Write a protein that binds this ligand. Sequence first.
Ligand code: HEM
Ligand code: HEM
Lengths: 59, 49, 54, 271, 422, 101, 442
Amino acid sequence: ALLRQAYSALFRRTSTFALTVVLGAVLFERAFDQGADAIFEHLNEGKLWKHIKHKYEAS
Amino acid sequence: VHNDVTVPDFSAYRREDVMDATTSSQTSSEDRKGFSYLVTATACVATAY
Amino acid sequence: APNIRKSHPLLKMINNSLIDLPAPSNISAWWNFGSLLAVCLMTQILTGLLLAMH
Amino acid sequence: YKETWNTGVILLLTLMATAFVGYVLPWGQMSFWGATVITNLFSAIPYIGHTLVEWAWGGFSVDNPTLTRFFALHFLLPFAIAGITIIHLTFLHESGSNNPLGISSDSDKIPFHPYYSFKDILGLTLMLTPFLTLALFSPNLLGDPENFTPANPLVTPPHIKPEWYFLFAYAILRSIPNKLGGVLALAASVLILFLIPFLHKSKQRTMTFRPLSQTLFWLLVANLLILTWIGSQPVEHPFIIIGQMASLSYFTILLILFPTIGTLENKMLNY
Amino acid sequence: CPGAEDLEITKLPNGLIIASLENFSPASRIGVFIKAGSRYETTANLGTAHLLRLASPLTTKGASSFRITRGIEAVGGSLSVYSTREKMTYCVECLRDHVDTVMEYLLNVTTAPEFRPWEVTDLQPQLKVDKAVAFQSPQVGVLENLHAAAYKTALANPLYCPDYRIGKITSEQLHHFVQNNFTSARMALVGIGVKHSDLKQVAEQFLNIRSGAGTSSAKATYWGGEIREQNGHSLVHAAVVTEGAAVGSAEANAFSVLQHVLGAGPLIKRGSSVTSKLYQGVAKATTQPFDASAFNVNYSDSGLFGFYTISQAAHAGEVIRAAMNQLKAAAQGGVTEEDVTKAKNQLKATYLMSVETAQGLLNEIGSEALLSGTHTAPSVVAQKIDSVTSADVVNAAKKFVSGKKSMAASGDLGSTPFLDEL
Amino acid sequence: GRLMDRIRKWYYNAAGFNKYGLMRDDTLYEDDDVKEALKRLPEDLYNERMFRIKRALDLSLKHRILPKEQWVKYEEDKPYLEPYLKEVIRERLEREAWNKK
Amino acid sequence: TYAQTLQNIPETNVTTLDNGLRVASEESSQPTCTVGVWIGAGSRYENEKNNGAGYFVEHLAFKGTKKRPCAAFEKEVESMGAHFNGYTSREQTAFYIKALSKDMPKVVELLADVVQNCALEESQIEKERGVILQELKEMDNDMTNVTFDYLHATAFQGTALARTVEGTTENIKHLTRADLASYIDTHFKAPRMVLAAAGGISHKELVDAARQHFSGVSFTYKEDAVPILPRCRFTGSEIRARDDALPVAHVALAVEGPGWADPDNVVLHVANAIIGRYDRTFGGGKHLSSRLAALAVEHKLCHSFQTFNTSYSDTGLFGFHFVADPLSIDDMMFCAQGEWMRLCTSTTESEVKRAKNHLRSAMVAQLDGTTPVCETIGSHLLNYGRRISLEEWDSRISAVDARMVRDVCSKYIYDKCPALAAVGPIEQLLDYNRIRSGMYWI
Ligand code: HEM
Ligand code: HEM
């Protein structure tokens, strides 16, 4: 049971609750950004420089 | 007199696990708290971000 | 006094107006505007300074 | 009165930042140059040095983006001073004022008004006279003439030094040859005030009845005067050495002599 | 391993008696017994005995108030002072292993009080409190006024510091009261749960305020007064007595037995007392609930006897009257040779039961060792109890009906009668 | 010799709190101990010190001092609180030490 | 030595009669004694309709039996100098007698006659009914018990344990000769009873006299089986009976307890030994060792306070109670919860070492006389199923250390939703929420 375990190891001690909020945030950021960026780009296929860049990318 | 006093019935509000008056509520405690706290811990993470 | 929240000349202030302050139990959402106005203010000043620096 | 005192140190620090940024506003030779030398000091702080400075400057050198954020800061800080002054007096009032004899004055207190309202209004005019006399007859008696010259990045003035009220520390800065140590020494020169309360060994509060501590006190004052003076002169003999000497005596007096002479004084009283 | 030991009991030059008895209990209970109390107070130092009782945890010459409390507590010890109008006992309890530790403080408290002006000064307001919780029992209020109406001195002196004297007692008064009463010939170092030699070595080579009898209590002079406290409570408490028998007297046993014949407390929870003539007699008179008992006190140079009655207001009249008729009726030969045998046995038992308690024993043991210097064997005290004729009882009865009576009552007395109406 | 005694008497006179009519102990800074100490002083000594102190303050506010005749003489300076204050500290150190064990 | 005095404590003899009753006793060299039957019955065993019977029964247990009516029964006991007492709690009832060992047998007879043949005279009932009714009014003014009742009332709300031992007003106004009879015939049975005794009694002479008056045999297997009770559910909640007209306020707070059998109860007790108790008449005052007591004194926080570990067969209540003035309720509570937190997070060896000695002295004093010993035997069997000797208790207590007190208290107190009951002028004490948060972070 995660809720039970979670409670025990993460939410019971204030010190660990804090550690969770931090590490939790670090991972949440990394994933929330990638995901939203992903969504935004698909929603705008071929319009972003990221997309058309290749055409003139030739040094 | 105080002997004539009883606590009303909270079945309308109790959580599923502490609904049965003949079951130790302690066994489902870590769950009930673990959930609520899980919600809270998350709000912090969101805020932190 | 036992707990610092009440004795301290400053916490005592923060306490008697944001922690142990007696509030009616039935106030509605219409009472939320005081705090917002307050937050609203701190926010303007913050963004304002930032803008003034340019 | 620790808290009254500690907020006090904070008022001093704040006033310094305030008066420092204020001085750059007229953008004169000294304004600019002083700003360039003083702010660059932090560049000595390890690893996060340069970053912290270029951040503050808003660029690569004191330029327009600095002038603006300073004007902003200068307008702001004063108000923070006012706020904090309220806290200062708030802690102060918990205990009430102290007094020259250093012994409980509960057996003889008087209403502030009219006694002190009057006394202060008198002390206001007594000082205000010299202030006005100066401000009106000898206007620039205290200002560097170098600041009547528009800032020019291609002409370093001969002697870049901060305003008088800073010299004393500028002095302690140059005492320690080593960009990093000197900064810390500077920082300590003022932050030292936070320790005073923990260096009180006397069984008595004031120095009214401590003649030893008294000369030591006036020595220290004189010491600060010299430090101020050294700060105004160039970095050459015999100044350089006098500097280091005064800087040393400064910390010695506050960190070692004072508490020590304090203890000795207790034994002489049979305490 | 552990068996039958025999109660030893020395006596030193200065007159300090030392009783002892090892019953191999996993716990001890030493205790200093003393001839002192409100009985020795003068109009000038009233209450000083009381305050002294409360002052037990104040600093001494060998241990500070801090160490005395922390010290005793560090070993699950306990320290208490119980005292009557004429006796003060200082005892402590603890586990066998810590006696020597708890002993020091005990010793220090009774023979080395410093009574510092401040410590004292800050303690006095306590009397106001300690006295206020006690008087919650009306039971205690009348007894105070009883002794007041029963005597003109010594015993008439209240057990709790009178109000007007609160905060007026002085370190000197405390010091003097001690130096003049806590003297080696008025003290006993009783101790259950220890080897006599050990308890002895402590007393001698340690106790130092000494020798003499010091101040002597004036003879208890009988008055025969009547004090009435009109307060409004729906329940009226009343007590009517007559000078009774003294301690160590032979006419003592007589009253105790008359006591039990009349009725001294219930033995059946919520039960009626058929064996209690007094209770039963009253029961046939009033209809509402009540309580009536045979009151009996035996003091060094005097005693008190009569009855005590808690009753509804309006029925206080009927209840007291009855309690009386039942006493005269006893004096008029209304006692059965059986009634006497039942009593004698209830007394024997009650005596024997009120000794199982380590405290009850240490108390029984010490009381003798103080006002005697001996330990009456249990078969002797029995051989002494039953040896009481039917007459003896009826005689005690007579004495009450004939002697001058002094009454003390409190409550809504509107319907309660005066001493000269009985 | 009397070196220590020469010094003390000198410092005592050097300090000069006796020109106000104050006693060594009157100048003690009222920290936690001195506070308890004072509460234990017998009333007569407390009231006296109070007058002395209040008198000193009045001199201070007046920028005057007592006439030489009235100055407290080194050898007659009564150490009225010292004894109490020492026990107050003895007591504390006991408690401080005990709570540690 | 302490150690030895313990080993040398005579053993407690326990033999079971073919009918299920258990006879136990501790023989001493004492001329007087205490024998009685301790029963596994009480308000908990009652129900909505008979709640109070066990108490109504208690009121008649002495008003005479069939073989020898009121007058006679009373007269026969008084006349032998014996004391007859008894009580009834939520999970335990008991009737015991104090008399000379010489009458140990005639006593046993009397007992058996009370539990087995109570008169239940139709005319007596209607009187004790008026009596009990007044006892309720008198008890209603004892805030301390009005509080613990409410504590239960909510801590175990909706269950068997949430019932008062005395019972409802209605229940007492209508209970019947029948219901009472039924209660006795349903609950007072050999397998659930214990004839205990202590003093100068011979186990034999006792057990013999036992078989003689406690002969009733059982036929079916059901009659030999002790019925297990449906358990009671704990609930973090509060009940506030306010009345600014009362002079002081009463507060009780508690988390669920482990129940008789659990070993932790020892540590739990060792814990409460640390927090201990106070009451304005303790002379120790500011020097008392109990941190809470001190604060109580230094800051005039309360008139008294007590820690408790009320155990039951399958559950319990571990908390505290205090009486304070309307304006010092909060600081008091605040400090109190503080100590509980201190137990969980920072107990000291010094603290426990003492707590232990205080506890040891406690257990020993619980056996000060014959009635108290008998009460301990009557209970150990009924709850632990045997006798735990001071020699044992001591070993279990001696093994407790800080690290241990911490773990347990944490296990039962930390971050648990407590049950709270307040009575009186409790305005300053407020919000369950706030109190709930006082349950974590020292
Ligand atoms: C009381 C809160 C404030 C209010 C209601 C407020 C309102 C406004 C308004 C309406 C404008 C015009 C915005 C636009 O359309 O361009 C403005 C501009 C500005 N404000 Fe504020 N302001 C507040 C506080 C401040 C403060 C405290 C500062 C900084 C000390 C500040 C600095 C500025 C600056 C620099 C601009 C100009 C730049 C811009 O127009 O975006 N403001 N403010
Ligand atoms: C914005 C600057 C400040 C303001 C306006 C301010 C104002 C005051 C005022 C009004 C008083 C009461 C009257 C008096 O004794 O002078 C006071 C007292 C005091 N201030 Fe400041 N103060 C300031 C800075 C400081 C600083 C830098 C310190 C010291 C580091 C300080 C330390 C104190 C202390 C200790 C008192 C107690 C006076 C006593 O001995 O009775 N103050 N201040």
